[PDB]
Design a protein around this ligand. Structure first.
Ligand code: SF4
Ligand code: FES
Lengths: 111, 96, 74, 110
């Protein structure tokens, strides 16, 4: 249900439905917070990845108190943290504002 | 060993009995005073307070330069009482 | 590990709060202190200190490490 | 807001006193100060705005992640990128940040 080629923001009630609906396109999740520098640094570069890799759904999760339960279900301590899913399940992860990493990580999913 | 610290809270005035080998902040807390703080290792300027009268021993402090201490400030999370004294709490908002 | 144990810094640990070389880099590796606290909770609710093992050394100096940066002795 | 000020002034003085430098992209520095301060205004302590906790109120009483946090204090490791050591690819040659900057980064942030 998320818009391809763009970064879609989800919540505890919309993440799993969207993931279960990506089929073959790998999903990338940005777990962030509104006032965390590194996260903010990745923001711009994270959007462009979405715009550049139209064959991968890019999502984002505000890790506040409204989404505390999903955040716990997924698992996070460092911000930002990217979970990578392919076929209804997490297959890899990247913690920190590492463009080089997050990327090589994505490229692995586009198999 | 115990001196009597007088704290000038923005909400009122309080006087607690701080021992000599105890920090003003930790002393304040035993009487139910809710004084501010962050690190509690004399490295920030949150617990920061000011001396109106008396002598402390904030020798473990490390964030306040020489001009700030001479100006009369102090870090209550690391400040030790050396005499009876009066410290104004919440004195950061105008420390810079 | 637990409070009371004696330990040795078996991994590169560069602090800056050492009275010996205050305000300047210094590798703690090789020093033997004693675990003084292990931070995992606080009033029943979990904390998340990335360096939960607190060790107290010689010269009223103490530092924080991860479990792997230290090895029990005896 | 007066709280946002102190947080900024702590930042500047702490960087100078430890020779740490602010990130080249001061916007990153403004958000670490904003969220750093936006925490003091809610929990009473500048609890690190760049990590996820299970119980902020508790994290704060423990004080491990209260800025300056243990790591930054013992090992100069500031995960928020507020304080970077010289030999760091993100550093800048600044230890101060115009107050006008944070305010404008508080709005552009949307
Ligand atoms: S020094 Fe530690 S507490 Fe302060 S902003 Fe950096 S990570 Fe957060
Ligand atoms: S909490 Fe850092 S000096 Fe008091």
């Amino acid at each position: 249900e998320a818009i391809v080629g763009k970064v879609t923001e989800v919540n505890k009630d919309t993440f799993w439905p969207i993931v279960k609906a990506a089929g073959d396109k790998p999903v990338v999740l940005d777990m962030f917070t509104q006032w965390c520098g590194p996260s903010k640094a990745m923001a711009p570069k994270y959007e462009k990845l979405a715009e550049e890799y139209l064959d991968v759904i890019f999502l984002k999760l505000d890790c506040n108190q409204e989404n505390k339960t999903l955040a716990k279900e997924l698992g996070i301590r460092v911000v930002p943290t990217f979970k990578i899913l392919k076929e209804n399940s997490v297959v890899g992860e990247v913690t920190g504002a590492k463009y080089d990493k997050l990327l090589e990580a994505i490229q692995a999913a586009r198999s | 060993a115990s001196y009597t610290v007088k704290l000038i809270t923005p909400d009122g005035e309080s006087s607690i009995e701080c021992s000599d080998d105890t920090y003003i902040l930790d002393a304040a807390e035993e009487a139910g005073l809710e004084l501010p703080y962050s690190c509690r290792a004399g490295a920030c300027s949150t617990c920061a307070g000011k001396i109106t009268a008396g002598s402390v021993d904030q020798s473990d402090q490390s964030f306040l330069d020489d001009d700030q201490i001479e100006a009369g400030y102090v870090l209550t999370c690391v400040a030790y009482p050396t005499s009876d004294c009066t410290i104004e709490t919440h004195k950061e908002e105008d420390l810079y | 590990m637990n409070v009371g144990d004696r330990v040795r810094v078996t991994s590169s640990v560069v602090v800056y709060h050492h009275p010996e070389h205050k305000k300047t880099a210094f590798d703690l590796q090789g020093m033997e202190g004693e675990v003084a606290a292990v931070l995992t909770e606080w009033q029943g609710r979990p904390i998340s200190a990335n360096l939960p093992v607190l060790v107290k050394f010689e010269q009223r100096f103490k530092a924080h490490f991860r479990p792997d940066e230290v090895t029990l002795i005896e | 807001n007066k709280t946002l000020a102190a947080m900024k002034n702590f930042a500047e003085q702490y960087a100078k006193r430890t020779d740490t430098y602010f990130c080249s992209d001061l916007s990153v520095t403004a958000v670490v100060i904003e969220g750093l301060a936006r925490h003091k205004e809610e929990l009473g302590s500048p609890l690190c705005p760049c990590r996820h906790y299970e119980d902020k109120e508790a994290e704060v009483k423990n004080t491990f992640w209260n800025c300056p946090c243990v790591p930054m204090r013992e090992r100069k490791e500031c995960h928020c990128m507020l304080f970077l050591t010289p030999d760091n690819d993100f550093a800048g040659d600044a230890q101060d940040i115009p107050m006008e900057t944070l305010e404008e980064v508080k709005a552009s942030m949307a």
